[PDB]
Design a protein around this ligand. Sequence first.
Ligand SMILES: Nc1nc2c(ncn2[C@@H]2O[C@H](COP(=O)(O)OP(=O)(O)NP(=O)(O)O)[C@@H](O)[C@H]2O)c(=O)[nH]1
Ligand code: MET
Ligand SMILES: [Mg+2]
Lengths: 92, 595
Amino acid sequence: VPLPEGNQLFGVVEQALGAGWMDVRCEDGKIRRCRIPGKLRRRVWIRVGDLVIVQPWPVQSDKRGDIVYRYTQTQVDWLLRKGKITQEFLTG
Amino acid sequence: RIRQPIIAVLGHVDHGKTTLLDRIRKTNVAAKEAGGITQHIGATEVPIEVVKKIAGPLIKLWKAEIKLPGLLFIDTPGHEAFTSLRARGGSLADLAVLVVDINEGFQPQTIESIEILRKYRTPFVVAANKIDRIKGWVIEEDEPFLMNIKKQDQRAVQELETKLWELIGKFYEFGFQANRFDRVQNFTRELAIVPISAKYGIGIAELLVLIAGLSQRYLEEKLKIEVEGPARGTILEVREEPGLGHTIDVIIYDGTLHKDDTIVVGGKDKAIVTKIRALLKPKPLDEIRDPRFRFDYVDEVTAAAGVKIAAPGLEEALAGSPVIAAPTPEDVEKAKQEILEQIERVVISTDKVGVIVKADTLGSLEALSKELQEKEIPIRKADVGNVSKTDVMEALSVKEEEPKYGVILGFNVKVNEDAEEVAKAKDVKIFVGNVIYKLIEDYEEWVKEEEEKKKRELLSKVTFPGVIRLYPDERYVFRRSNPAIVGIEVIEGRIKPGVTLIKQNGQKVGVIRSIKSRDEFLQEAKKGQAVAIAIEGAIVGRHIHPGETLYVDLSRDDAITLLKHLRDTLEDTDIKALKMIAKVKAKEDPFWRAI
RNA sequence: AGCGGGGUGGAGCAGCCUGGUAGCUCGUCGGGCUCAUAACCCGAAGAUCGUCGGUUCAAAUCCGGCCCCCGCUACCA
Ligand SMILES: Nc1nc2c(ncn2[C@@H]2O[C@H](COP(=O)(O)OP(=O)(O)NP(=O)(O)O)[C@@H](O)[C@H]2O)c(=O)[nH]1
Ligand code: MET
Ligand SMILES: [Mg+2]
């Protein structure tokens, strides 16, 4: 339900790299090696192909970022119906 | 006991401000400086004896005395950047001399000087230079205008009359009534215009006697000072000296100043209290900022005079702040309360992310800061001193995240051995200079050169777009495989060797091996040119068909660079080709769908 | 361009030559075994043969025309 606020933007998980590292495709047509904060790492399980919010790192904000929130099925369905995001971004 | 009145000279660039003072002193200073412009304010004392020698029988026309001990002249830059120096000179001095060239008329600096004089209610008399520019004028060494006028013809006199009439009319729409010194009798609302010649000393005596005489008419009671009271003066500048440390040059005008007296000076953040250690005095008839002769140390000085004070802990002194003598703690508190009623005329705005600039005085730093701020350039730090090692470290720290803002601009300073070695090792650029514009323009042009070099090598990396169509003609096919030799006409874009071609479905037909319009070897083909391509990996039929349209494979980074960086070198055919290529490629990646 | 070879469940191969059931291994879905997963067992779905025509009592099998794929050679702007 919460939306990106600032430099944050959506993203689609592509492949997990191990040791809490994911490979997320963002809305600006860039692939980023993203790091999962440990606070939500322990309680929220993330799997390839999900809509998430990613904030790029302050330095070298082109290939690194942090994942802050995961969108459930109802939230992504509501977003698709509202029209803030399209279907081809999710499906690739 | 009457103190020497303080006279401030104001005017525009190249209007003979320094030359008049040089002629009065009979010394050459105007040729010393670089660029012909004086960027430092100074105070000079003129003894009354040379004043009397310069003058003559004219002193007997006015019923007064020459009991004035002397004169205290202050020079002032006329450049646009040094506004604060002009303001300080206008506020501090008791009398002003505006020097305006007759030929050029009026300049914005003259208007600003008049505005400052009106704001600080300083009476003044107008001077006129460049008299020799009028044709048919004879030159004689040091004669008054009254003696010179009879030596000229009617044409020069009438031209002079017209020019001064125009000047008086100008002052009139500036709301000021003007009349010639020998052509007016009122001396409370009417000014006086003295036509002078700096290069040949014409009319200097009239101006000198007028300055001597007008002092006691408007206000003379302000010129009486007790010779035993506490010292009271103001700061003129703050500069570094070899062997003495941070010293300040001040003009004492109240009381008497002795050595070891405690003084109160308004610092940047709060008042500072220190004990005087060294009192230094310039030689008579010598510019204070030009130490031609050796300074004479002096135990005590009496108002009014310009002296250099060397005391500990003066590195945070504010230019223009007053100095008050205080021998007792209650006097110290009263001086602190007096200082608390003082405003900082100029404050620098630092953005914490900017360049590092260092000068030798506070006024030069203010001028440089204003000139940089006029061009929208942030300033990380401004202070007084030579370029040290930590400055290079700070510059490297700023450069780490901003290539164009890590640089040092030194204005009349020195670079240490360790600092220059570290700068050479870590490749940090330093621009040293003595002239404000000659120093700023160098930085601007270096920034422009770096900017152009940023994209000079970027062009070679990207690949131009291109769309072509095979001839439906059998003739153009000259070899089928290894290599495939077939003619082509260009629809849009530019063909280059070593560029991959793809179809709508994106099959790798290979890489163009060679292009030839004839038996001769070619390099590239532009719009409306036919060329036979010899390509590898392409075979007629299964891989390519006659009459089929071929597209150049494009890199998305190259497309972004073309649409954002190299947007100047894009024309109709190129943009049409790139747009339709994006439309075609909008099949798998939504990036081309959104273009 | 000329010559030669081949198209069969989602994938890779038999079934031709000698016409008359369309099989083999992997893969998907469901149930079994185990505390659970993999391995293993059971059952079921899935091609009507690249299209069109000729022949024959009857054609994936014999024949011919097209569509596509693969290989070899000639082929210098
Ligand atoms: N022909 C002629 N040239 C003059 C006369 N007075 C000065 N000049 C020349 O004109 C120039 C004036 O420069 P300067 O002495 O700097 O003027 P200023 O009054 O100090 N202005 P600033 O220091 O800001 O430029 C010099 O080159 C000087 O030789 C004059 O009466 N006649
Ligand atoms: C080479 O033979 C040449 N005439 C083929 C066509 S060039 C466009
Ligand atoms: Mg000058």
